[PDB]
């Protein structure tokens, strides 16, 4: 059955991006998916999206641009020390110039560079590049 | 047409479409053709939206006229049902026609008797003319094709949805394509009808040639 609604959503986004689609429908939605796509969007990979509020678990319709290469989930959510953050960005990211690792802190769901700025570490959620 | 009143459909051209049978498509329907078709019948034959066909003719004319040298366009037809029309299209426009068998490697093989490098490709039937489409895929040619309801849209860049099984449909589609590329070129006024009358372009069908020779 369905564990992890962020794994399903990122896999759907990745495949519908690989096939060149302009829009994606991801169901179910979740606060962690909304914030993941938000921090995707703030960096200029994913662009606009929409939340169709069914009274059950609603859907998200994502407008895509071809700027994305890979959106992936890291399961299980390992606990990322700040002393451990370079050995995770040397393993998941393709460069030292671009790409991000999404990690969740008590300060919120954010990227690895904003985590370095705010000095806090957290669990990992996924990556996008 | 960019919603221009000059470029829009005319009643005479409606009558020409309805008389030709261009709207009357085939029985089967490929899925990528569903955008150009409205609905099939209780008979089993789909009906082509003629305004989409007209707009695709306008887009193809905009593509062809955009080439500076008229000899760059290679205009091809292998099936007899359109071999004659393609010839006068060259005489209408100045493109280089391929009638009959198309030698494989015409667009790729540089040490070849018949080797040529076009900038565009205009094709009667993508089902029958499978070879020049792939040879366009090797050497970067945009392709215009006169696609039926059941037509593979591989390697076509403009698909003009029309009947191409009949002779009258092929001839008339080639006729309005030639008329429109000349009108965009400016050698004919859009107001006055074209003097070249479309029954010239139709297939001759040698038995019909003979019965027309006795009927003289």
């Amino acid at each position: 059955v369905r564990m992890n609604v962020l794994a399903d959503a990122l896999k759907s986004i990745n495949n519908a991006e690989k096939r060149g689609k302009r829009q994606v429908l991801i169901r179910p939605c979740s606060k962690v998916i909304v914030r993941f796509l938000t921090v995707m969007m703030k960096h200029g990979y994913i662009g606009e999206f929409e939340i169709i509020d069914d009274h059950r678990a609603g859907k998200i319709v994502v407008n895509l641009t071809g700027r994305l290469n890979k959106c992936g989930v890291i399961s299980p959510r390992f606990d990322v020390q700040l002393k451990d953050l370079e050995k995770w960005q040397n393993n998941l990211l393709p460069s030292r110039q671009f790409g991000f690792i999404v990690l969740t802190t008590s300060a919120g769901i954010m990227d690895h560079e904003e985590a370095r700025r705010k000095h806090t570490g957290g669990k990992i959620l996924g990556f996008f590049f | 047409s960019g919603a221009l009143d000059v470029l829009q459909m005319k009643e005479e051209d409606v009558l020409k479409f309805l008389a030709a049978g261009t709207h009357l498509g085939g029985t089967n329907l490929d899925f990528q053709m569903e955008q150009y078709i409205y609905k099939r019948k209780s008979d089993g034959i789909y009906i082509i939206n003629l305004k989409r066909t007209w707009e695709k003719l306008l887009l193809a004319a905009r593509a062809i006229v955009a080439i500076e040298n008229p000899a760059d366009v290679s205009v091809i037809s292998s099936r007899n049902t359109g071999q004659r029309a393609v010839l006068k299209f060259a005489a209408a426009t100045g493109a280089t026609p391929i009638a009959g068998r198309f030698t494989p490697g015409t667009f790729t093989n540089q040490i070849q008797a018949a080797f040529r490098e076009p900038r565009l490709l205009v094709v009667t039937d993508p089902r029958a003319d499978h070879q020049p489409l792939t040879e366009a895929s090797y050497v970067n040619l945009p392709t215009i094709a006169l696609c039926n309801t059941d037509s593979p849209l591989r390697y076509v860049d403009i698909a003009i949805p029309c009947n191409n099984k009949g002779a009258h449909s092929v001839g008339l589609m080639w006729w309005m394509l030639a008329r429109e590329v000349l009108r965009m070129r400016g050698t004919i006024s859009r107001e006055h009808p074209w003097e070249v009358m479309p029954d010239l372009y139709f297939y001759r069908d040698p038995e019909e040639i003979e019965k027309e020779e006795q009927a003289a």
């Binding site: - | 000059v6 990528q32 707009e55 593509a63 955009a66 945009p142 009108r183 965009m184």
Partner: protein, 82 residues
């Protein structure tokens, strides 16, 4: 591509597909750079200006090139609405 000094130190910046934003490859021989003529608004005359569309090899292989061209021309107003 752009070092911190300020030179755009790269051989060339390849064109990108106007349908799916992919990088047009150097040996992407099914690539299309197609020019579509722009008309005169009142007369129906070819002005001499055109709009350019790039199609990658993959979309043209799948047969979705004509749909991409139609939606591009419609969004650019070469095709009327509907």
């Amino acid at each position: 591509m752009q070092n911190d000094a300020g030179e755009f130190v790269d051989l060339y910046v390849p064109r990108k597909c106007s349908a799916s934003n992919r990088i047009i490859g150097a040996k992407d021989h099914a690539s299309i750079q197609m020019n579509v003529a722009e008309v005169d608004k009142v007369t129906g005359r070819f002005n001499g200006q055109f709009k350019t569309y790039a199609i990658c090899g993959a979309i043209r292989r799948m047969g979705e090139s004509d749909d991409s061209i139609l939606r591009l021309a419609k969004a650019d107003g070469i095709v009327s609405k509907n």
